[PDB]
Amino acid sequence: YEPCWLRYERKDQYSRLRFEEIVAKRTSPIFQAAVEELQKGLRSMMEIEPQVVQEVNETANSIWLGTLEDEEFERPLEGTLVHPEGYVIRSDVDDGPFRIYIIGKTDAGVLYGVFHFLRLLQMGENIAQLSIIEQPKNRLRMINHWDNMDGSIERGYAGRSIFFVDDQFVKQNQRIKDYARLLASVGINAISINNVNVHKTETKLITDHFLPDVAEVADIFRTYGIKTFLSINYASPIEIGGLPTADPLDPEVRWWWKETAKRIYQYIPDFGGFVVKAPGPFTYGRDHAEGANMLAEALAPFGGLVIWRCFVYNCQQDWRDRTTDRAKAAYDHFKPLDGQFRENVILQIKNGPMDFQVREPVSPLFGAMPKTNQMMEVQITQEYTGQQKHLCFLIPQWKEVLDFDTYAKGKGSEVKKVIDGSLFDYRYSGIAGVSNIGSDPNWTGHTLAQANLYGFGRLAWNPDLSAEEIANEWVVQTFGDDSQVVETISWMLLSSWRIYENYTSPLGVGWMVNPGHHYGPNVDGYEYSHWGTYHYADRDGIGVDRTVATGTGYTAQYFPENAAMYESLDTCPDELLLFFHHVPYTHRLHSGETVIQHIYNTHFEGVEQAKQLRKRWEQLKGKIDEKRYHDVLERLTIQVEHAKEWRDVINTYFYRKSGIDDQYGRKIYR
C-alpha cells in the first residue's frame, strides 16, 4: 500500500539538515513512536541516522523531545501551553550547535509536534529560526469506521475492511500501525473500529470472546495517542446477555451494562467508550436522555464516554403529508432534552439535518443546546458525493459548515465554536468523520481522496486553516513541489465539489440519486418513498416549502438572523433555495437565472468542467509516477462519462416536466 502523505521523499544535496542526535527525555510508548517516526523521516528524507540519547550533548546538533517537566529551563512560549495535546517547536537562539526543541504539554503533544516538524521538512520550510506553538481546538478529533466483521464496509468505496475478515480480526497488524501513523500525523485522537449498525457478530465485540483482539488493536492505537471506541448494539442485554428486555430503566439491564463496562476496562484501561446508534429506548417508551444516561452511568466510574448519534427520524414518513418534515426531526427530538443528559454523553449530529447530501443547510441543533455536549459528524466516504469515482475534495464544504454563524449568542457564534466547546463551555466535544479507507493499495479508492482524510484531520485540529493551505500541504507532501503540479492538483481539489454539485441535485434540494446504492442520477428515485426526501417537482415548479408562513416551519429552528434569511424568498441564498422554498421554474435567482435555466446551465457546464479536470491532469504526465498518474486518469475518465449521464438524465427529466427548452439550444434528449 501507499504511504499517502507520509512519503518522506529523499531531498537533493542542497535541502538537507545536519543532526547528530535525537534527545528523548522519556521512554513511554508514545515517545518511542515519536522517536521512530523522526528516525524514519530523517533517514528517508535527509539520509542521516542521528543517535537516540536521553541527555543533551551541548556540542552536538540535536532535536530535543520532552514535556515541560523535562525542561532544564522553561521558556515563556511553552509556558503558555494549557491544552494537554499542545506543543511548542523552537530553534535555539544560541550561536553554537543547532538545536530544535519539541516541547509538548504531554507525551501526545510531543508526538504531534514531531509530525509537525516532519511536515515542515516535507514541505521544504526553512527551520533555522522556528518559533511555533500549536494547541488543537477540538478535544475529540475522531474517525468512525463502518466496517463489518465479514470484511465488508457499509458505504465503503475503497476496498474491504483492514480490521476484519471472516468474522475475525486480521492476523497481520502492520497495516493497522501504518494507519495509526497516518491518523496521528493529522492529529486524530479517537477511533471507533466497527459499523454503527452493529450486526450479530459485531455485537460480541464487547464480550470476552473478542476483547483480547480489540485490546491488541487498542494497544497499537494507544502508542499513537489514539483512544479506541466500540459501536454497540443497544439490544445486547437480550442478544448476548440472556435478559428479557433492553429497557434502560430495567434494573437488571442497568447492571448488565455496568458489568460489561467493567469487563471491557479490565482489557482496555483507557477505553474511550461507546458510539451508539439507537430493540431501543423508544421500544420501551423511554427518551434519548434516559437511554444515553444509562450507558453513561455504566462508563462513568471508568471515565468512558457515550457518543449518542442524533440521526433519528421517522423512516416511515408519508410523502402525501407536506406538513411533516424530516429536516425538523433531529431538532424536535433533542432540543427539548437539553440539560437532561449526563456530563459524559456527547450528542453526535451530522453537518446537515438530512443525510450527507452534496449540499445541506447546517443542522439547527448546533447552537440550540447550551447544556448538552455536541460534536459534529461529517462523512469522508463519498456516499452521495461521487463514491470516490468522481473527485470531491470535501474540505471547502466542511469549512462552510464550521464557519456558519448560528448567532446563538449573537454574532460570532460559528458552528466551530459550538463543537470546540468554547461557546458553551462543553466538557467533551469535537468532530467525527466517517472513514473513507479500505484495503485498496491507495487506501481511499481514488488516489486524490487521500486529501479528504488528511484534510479532515487538519480541520479537526484547527478549523481556521484555509482550504487552500490544506490542499497545498497535501499536494506537496504527496506529489512534490513542482509549481505546475502543485497549482494544478490544488485547483482540481478546490474546484471539485462545486463541479460535482453542478451536475447533480440543484439548489440544495438534494437527492435525485438511485435508491439503494445511492450512486448515479434518478430524479424520482426516492420521490414517492417513505424516507421523507422529496423535491416535489411538477410541471410548474419545484422545491420544499420549509417556511413558517406557508410551509413546514423548519426555518424557525434557526436563530432569528438566519431564520429570516431563509424565510424570505428574496433573501434566501440561491444555493439552498429549493431546500427552503417551492418555486416556479421561471423564478429568477440572484444570479439572474430562472430556476429551470440554472438547472440546465450547471449540468451542461459541470460536464465541461469535469472534462477540464481530466485535461489538466493529463498535462501533468511525466511529472507524476506512471502508476498514480494512470490510477487517477482512469477515475477522471470514469467521472467524465458518468457526469454526462447525470447531465442528460437531469436535463431530460426537467425538460419533460417543465417543457422549457435550454436557453442556448444545447443538446437535451427528448
Add this chain to the structure above:
Amino acid sequence: YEPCWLRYERKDQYSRLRFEEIVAKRTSPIFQAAVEELQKGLRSMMEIEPQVVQEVNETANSIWLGTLEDEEFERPLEGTLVHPEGYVIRSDVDDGPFRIYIIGKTDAGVLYGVFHFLRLLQMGENIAQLSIIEQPKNRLRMINHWDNMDGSIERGYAGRSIFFVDDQFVKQNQRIKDYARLLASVGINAISINNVNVHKTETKLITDHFLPDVAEVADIFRTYGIKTFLSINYASPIEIGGLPTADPLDPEVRWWWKETAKRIYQYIPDFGGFVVKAPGPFTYGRDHAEGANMLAEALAPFGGLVIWRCFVYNCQQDWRDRTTDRAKAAYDHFKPLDGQFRENVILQIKNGPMDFQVREPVSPLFGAMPKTNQMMEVQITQEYTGQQKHLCFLIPQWKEVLDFDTYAKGKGSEVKKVIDGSLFDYRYSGIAGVSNIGSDPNWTGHTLAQANLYGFGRLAWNPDLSAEEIANEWVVQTFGDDSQVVETISWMLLSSWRIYENYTSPLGVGWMVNPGHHYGPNVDGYEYSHWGTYHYADRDGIGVDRTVATGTGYTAQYFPENAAMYESLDTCPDELLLFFHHVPYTHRLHSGETVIQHIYNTHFEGVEQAKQLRKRWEQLKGKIDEKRYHDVLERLTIQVEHAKEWRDVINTYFYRKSGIDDQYGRKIYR
C-alpha cells in the same frame, strides 16, 4: 404443509362408491404410484380399502388399470388413442358388477387417468356411465425452478427451496414426493430443478459430486412420469472443466460436453436434457444456433433435449436513443436463424417480448419460425404481478396469449397451435412455467396462488379449457362445494388480474415498479436506466412509438393482420395502446376516456375492487377453516393497503406531470 387441491375430503354417506378390488395389470414404478394414489384417494374420500390384484374377478366391483396391451378386448374408443400419455376412462355397460376401466396408451397415461378419475370423485361427478378420452395437446408441460443451492429462490415469494439448503440437497424427500404428486395430478411431465442463472455451486450439478443426489431426485420424479432437467452454466468447460475457453466451436469444448452428457446418463438414463440461459457463445463471436447445436450434439446420442431460452437483449441500452427497441430484440436475433437449429433444440420464448409484465403483447417470435421447435415460458411466480401479496389468477392472461391468432398460416394460427406443434409439425414443443412454490406450509405464499400452479398444468394439458372451469375445479377440490364458496372464490380468481392491472401500469406500457425487488409503485423507477423499459411520459403525453410510420417499427414483426391493427392509432386496442403509440394525455380511447382520465379511473376504481375482494372473502367466514381463512384475509388486507399506495403514487405522478385533474374530483395528493 397443505395437500393443496388433493384434499380427498371425506364424503357424506350419500356420495360414496362400492368397490372391492383395484386390478393393476402392471407392476412398474408408475403403476405403483397410480395404485397408491387410488388407494389414498378412495380411503380418504370413500372410506374403502379395495384389495389390489392383478387379474379381474368377474363378480367384484373393480377399477381396472392397464395399457392397451393388457386389455382382453380392445374397444373402439381406446383404439383411437395415439398420444403416449393419452388414456380412456369408461364404465362397463354390462348389467352385472360395476367396473371402471382406466386405459392408458402407456403407463404415464394410466397415471394421468387415475388422477382424472380422482378429480371426478373430488368434484362429486356421477361416474355411473363414464366415456372419457383425453390426450395432452402439448408434448412438453414443464416447470422451471429458479431455486439456488443456498436455499434462496430467485424471485421466490413462497419461502425457501424445497430442494436445497446449505449448498446441499435436502435429506428429507417426502415433500419432493408430494410435490411430484401435485405436478403429476395436473399433467406436468418435466422439471428443471435449479435456477436458470447458474452460480458457482450449481454449476457442479453436472459433476460426480452432485449427480448421485440429482439421480435420487430424478428417481422420485420418474415414478410420477416426470422427466428431470438441469439448467447449465455455458462456461462449465472453464469453471469446472479446466479448459481455456467455452467457445462452442473449440474441439475440446465440444468433446467436454459430450463426455459430460455421457456421465450424466450413466446416473440418469432418461435425463431430459439442459435448460440454457446464455462466457457465452457471443463471447466468441458465435450465434445461438452454433451455441445451442453444440450442446444438442452432446445430448443427441442419449435422446436429450436442449431448451434454449430466447430471453436475450442488450442489457446496456441507451434511453436517449428512441430508434432502438428492446421489444424487437428477441425476434431480430432468432428469426434469421430459423432452420439452423438441430432437431432436439427447442427455443423457449416468454409470452411477451419484454419481461413478464402484467400485460404485454404476444412475442412476435411465435409463428415466425416454421422450421424451429418453440415452447412458451410463462411466469407462475408473481414477480411483476403482486408477488403473492396481491391476488392474481394468471390463467385468463395465459389464455389470451394462447388464443392470440398469429395468422402465420392465415386465420386459425393461434399461439397454442404453434407451441403444441400442430401448426408447423414441431417434433418437440410445449410450455414451461416458472415455479411459484417454496417451503411455506401453503406452498405458494398466498393460499389462492395454489390456483396458478394448478391452472398452469390444466392449460398445459389442454389450452382449450376455460378459465371458468379451471377455477371451478380448483375451488371445489380445495374449498368444497358450498355454492356460495365456489361462486365467491371463483369470482375473486377470475377478476383478480384485471383488478391488479387496474392500479398498476396503464394501457400495456408496463413497468412503473421499484427497481431491484420489482415490488410496488415507482413510475420512473427504470425510466432512465439502461434496461430499455421506458414509457416516455412527459407533460403532454405518454407511450412508446413502436409504429413503422414514425416509430421503432416493432409492429412489422407481426403478420399483416395484427401489424395493421397495432400500427393504426385508431384500431390499436386500448389495453395495449401505450405499448405501441406515444399519445397526448387528451387522446380519446375506444372506451371514450381520455388517456389521463383512464389512468385516474382504473387506479381509483382498482382499489375499490380490491376492497370488494376482501369483503367477499370475509363473507365466507365460517365456511372455510380458520387457518386458511385468516391466512388469505391477512394477504387481502395487505393487498388493499398496498393498492392504495399504487393508486396514489401513480395518480399523483400523472397529475404533477399532466396538470389535468380527476374528472370526478376524487382525492389526488398534490
